[PDB]
Amino acid sequence: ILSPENAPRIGFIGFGAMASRMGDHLKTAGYTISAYTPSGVPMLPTPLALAKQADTVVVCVPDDEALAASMYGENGALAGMTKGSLLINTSSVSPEATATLYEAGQKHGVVVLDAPVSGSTPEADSASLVILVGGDKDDVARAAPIFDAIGKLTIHAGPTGSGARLKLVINGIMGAGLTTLAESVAYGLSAGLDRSMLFDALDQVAVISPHHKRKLKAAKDGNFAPQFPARLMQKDMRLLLDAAAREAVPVPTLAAATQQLSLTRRLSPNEDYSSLIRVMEKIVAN
Amino acid sequence: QILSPENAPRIGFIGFGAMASRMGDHLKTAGYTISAYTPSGVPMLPTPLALAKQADTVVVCVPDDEALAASMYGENGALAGMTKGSLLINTSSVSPEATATLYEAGQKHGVVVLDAPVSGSTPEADSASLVILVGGDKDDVARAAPIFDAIGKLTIHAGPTGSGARLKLVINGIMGAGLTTLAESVAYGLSAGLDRSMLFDALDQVAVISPHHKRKLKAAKDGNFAPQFPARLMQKDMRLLLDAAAREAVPVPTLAAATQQLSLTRRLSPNEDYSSLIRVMEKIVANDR
Amino acid sequence: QILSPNAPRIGFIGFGAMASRMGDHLKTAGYTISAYTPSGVPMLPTPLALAKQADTVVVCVPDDEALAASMYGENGALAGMTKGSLLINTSSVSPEATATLYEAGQKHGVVVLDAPVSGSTPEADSASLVILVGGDKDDVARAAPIFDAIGKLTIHAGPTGSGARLKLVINGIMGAGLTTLAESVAYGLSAGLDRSMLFDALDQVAVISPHHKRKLKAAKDGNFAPQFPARLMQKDMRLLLDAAAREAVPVPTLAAATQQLSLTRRLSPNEDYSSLIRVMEKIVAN
Amino acid sequence: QILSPENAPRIGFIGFGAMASRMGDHLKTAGYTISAYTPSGPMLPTPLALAKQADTVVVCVPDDEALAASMYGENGALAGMTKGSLLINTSSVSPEATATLYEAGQKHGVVVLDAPVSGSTPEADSASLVILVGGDKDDVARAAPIFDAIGKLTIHAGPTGSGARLKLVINGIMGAGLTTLAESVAYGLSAGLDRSMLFDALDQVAVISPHHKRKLKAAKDGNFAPQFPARLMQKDMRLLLDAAAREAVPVPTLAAATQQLSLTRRLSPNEDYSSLIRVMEKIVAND
DSSP: OOOTTTOOEEEEEOOSHHHHHHHHHHHHTTOEEEEEOSOOOOBOSSHHHHHHTOSEEEEOOSSHHHHHHHHSSTTOSGGGSOTTOEEEEOSOOOHHHHHHHHHHHHHTTOEEEEOOEEOOHHHHHTTOEEEEEESOHHHHHHTHHHHHHHEEEEEEEESTTHHHHHHHHHHHHHHHHHHHHHHHHHHHHHTTOOHHHHHHHHTTOTTSOHHHHHHHHHHHTTOOOOSSBHHHHHHHHHHHHHHHHHTTOOOHHHHHHHHHHHHHHHHOSSSBGGGHHHHHHHHHHO | OOOOTTTOOEEEEEOOSHHHHHHHHHHHHTTOEEEEEOTTOOOBOSSHHHHHHTOSEEEEOOSSHHHHHHHHSSTTSTGGGOOTTOEEEEOSOOOHHHHHHHHHHHHHTTOEEEEOOEEOOHHHHHTTOEEEEEESOHHHHHHTHHHHHHHEEEEEEEESTTHHHHHHHHHHHHHHHHHHHHHHHHHHHHHTTOOHHHHHHHHTTOTTSOHHHHHHHHHHHTTOOOOSSBHHHHHHHHHHHHHHHHHTTOOOHHHHHHHHHHHHHHHHOSSSBGGGHHHHHHHHHHTOO | OOOOOOOOEEEEEOOSHHHHHHHHHHHHTTOEEEEEOSOOOOBOSSHHHHHHTOSEEEEOOSSHHHHHHHHSSTTSSGGGOOTTOEEEEOOOOOHHHHHHHHHHHHHTTOEEEEOOEEOOHHHHHHTOEEEEEESOHHHHHHTHHHHHHHEEEEEEEESTTHHHHHHHHHHHHHHHHHHHHHHHHHHHHHTTOOHHHHHHHHTTOTTSOHHHHHHHHHHHTTOOOOSSBHHHHHHHHHHHHHHHHHTTOOOHHHHHHHHHHHHHHHHOSSSBGGGHHHHHHHHHHO | OOOOTTTOOEEEEEOOSHHHHHHHHHHHHTTOEEEEEOSOOOBOSSHHHHHHHOSEEEEOOSSHHHHHHHHSSTTSSGGGOOTTOEEEEOOOOOHHHHHHHHHHHHHTTOEEEEOOEEOOHHHHHTTOEEEEEESOHHHHHHTHHHHHHHEEEEEEEESTTHHHHHHHHHHHHHHHHHHHHHHHHHHHHHTTOOHHHHHHHHTTOTTSOHHHHHHHHHHHTTOOOOSSBHHHHHHHHHHHHHHHHHTTOOOHHHHHHHHHHHHHHHHOSSSBGGGHHHHHHHHHHTO
């Protein structure tokens, strides 16, 4: 069991908004934290150097390409870990990248848990993330104190790859929930409804999620400070639509939502993905 | 002038299906005398005219524009039987064009027409948990307050005439596309090998699904699509929303995609709950043809 | 029975770009042309006055609301027509408006042919129109000399309402053909392809229709002179999607195309509907 | 320099399916010696063995993964190729795979032309392909006798990667043209229009491409013998949507078409991609 007694050193590959917040809760729980970032808590110069001085590695990188850049190659992290140790990938990446990393870990004798999370920076702050993990039950159990420190609930989704897939499911719901809301608000405004009336009325209905009601209140205030930036939301939508095409599942609502989030990312990659509400308001004003 | 049971005891319904009869029950408990007309035939009246002649206030609950026009207009319609100064409350989900036509027809009869569709289904109608979405003048909305208070938990004054109809269209789009989004996401998860019970239970625990749609997901886990809101009506409501969005020239690609999925849903089962798309997508992924 | 120049007088209800060009070809074929327009080459002050002095009436109005305005009432065209005459509606209207006019005609003893056309102002100019006609085969035969003068081919689509439905079919192919082309071009430009190269290359492939190749060449030139204005194309898509919803037929590609044509109309109602190509180039230029 | 039969007589194929074999027949007639490696197995046993025996390598594989399996590693085609030669990739793959192969080629001193084609098996039969090629103009000129034998027109689309991108553009037009047509036909049938009237009327309008009119005529008769199978069309749409998302370009019509082609693939992966017309007819008929 990867308690702070048995494995105190946790090294991060990637240390952005989400990862830095999980690190704080792991530091509080008794772990000693280190990190590597491509740009440059003690910092290590390469992924390999990071892995060579950690008991457990947590990966939090944006996409398949960043995962490959830090996992493999001359300075890659995987070859720096000891056999029997645990690699916990919390990144939102494709099923293909997940399978490649799992198999590379098996060759090196390292068990890779695909453990993406549901929740954004507010949930990371409060350690109320939901961990979505694929792997053998005994390997999930080894990581329990790490998952417990950063989250409020650990869902064992199935074997390797199951966490990645469950994350894609939840991302699609979140993305299309926002584009649905932005489009419906835009119709209402175009049809002459008072803006303050409309935003407040929608807070009162049962057909909007708590997450999206929070986004709607923020959008009433024009507040799109990044909790989950458009560039990352839109990437997650791209991953989901590629996976759904590989499985030959028709998903027209998700596909439409993806195109709306491409427009959102193009106009403002770094503000919150909910900025599409403002985008649609501007379309109907003009 | 307030439409309390004291001053306007007789509430006559045009249309009296699942939603309306539940509203009528609550208005009975609050002290009103309920009558109704239905095209198929609480005392019944044979025509909309006969209904309106013996009612103080008329409440309309019909499925679409065509049913509205058939019962409101003409020598035997409801408007011909109403008296100047009275109020007609339309709770139907109809187009902005139908709403404007009825408002102006009401004005020629001296009848104020409130467009007051509701948010909520049969469980909310049963518990008087409906949210009333009403367009009209502030003082006419005040006149109807005791009626709205008996059937719902909250009255949203959306603006002048037509505003309630428009707000209902907004909420319908959120509801319909929320379901198609959920059905498609579950379908991907199943196609990718996720265990069904795991997946359904996991989604009940996330913050990005509405309480309404979490209820639908739990029913779909059991294959239960007994109708609370049938596919044929949800799909009609999306048709109305997409027509209105086109008239306003607002691009709504997510809502448009959802509408087409609800056309498939209606074609395969018009009368089961609109959430049956979850089953439709499960069968596509299972290759259950 | 046949309406050869037997019935020399043809009166038009509506006399815009399309109608005026069929007028010239009918005048060339030896008919006597008269017209009414809501705005105001003999011009008649009311639809009634037009119908009273014409043998056959041809209707070309933009939408359902305009059709009812000029067809019905004591000043409408039907009130001026004599039992046994033919009304030929070439307007692009809903199946419901078509049925309403057919039944109203029956009450006056007037057969209404729903005969919308495939082709735009260039085809009206050359009499290359394809006539899409619903009605009884004998009534279609009566109107043959009229249809021959304005077009190259008469398709008997079926009974009343069939012409209107076939026009909806063809409108959807046109509209979504353009949005498909605009989006594909937009991808190519966003990925760095030279604009002049790309427009010229696409003229060389077999998967674009002759109509849309002509629009692509015009779009290379920024030429969106209004052969078919965005406001009318988008209305036609609205009618198609309403009808498809009433028939409960899932049409996701047509539904997506409609939303792109809503944006097109919002930005420029009066330019050619192909201006979406320019709209998408502007999105890519960002 | 120029890759005429005199200077470079041996053309080795990596992959040899419906289009590649038809390409090879035309290069045979032009005077080259054709050899081929296929994963199933004159055939050579490995891509390495194929490349060692050829003067020019032409690649025709279905996707990025097949391309990587056959180009890279000690048994791959690049390890058997000589500095100064040309690899011509006609495969419909991603911009990312194209860039990876170009850069790998550079390391071996091998110029990689990304030269996918517009046209299907009938056009490969008649050498009526349109070549869509990315690369330096001097390298395109080197390959001209090869392109001329298999096609009727070579479009130089720009530098490396430009051919792959132009192919994605054309794939989108083709895929969404078909889904548009299937949906419009479905509406017409649902609205009561006679089927033969409807198919015959659409053959006579100017808003359908010659390619899609050929598909429509075949669909009239229920004929979906594969010229371009649903599984490959749908893969091409997947690649286009991924690329459009990477470029952040909103393409809702193309995205909708892709979902319809996912259904088409699921129901029949191996029949012609135009079978969506039949799928939609069956939806409207309630089977």
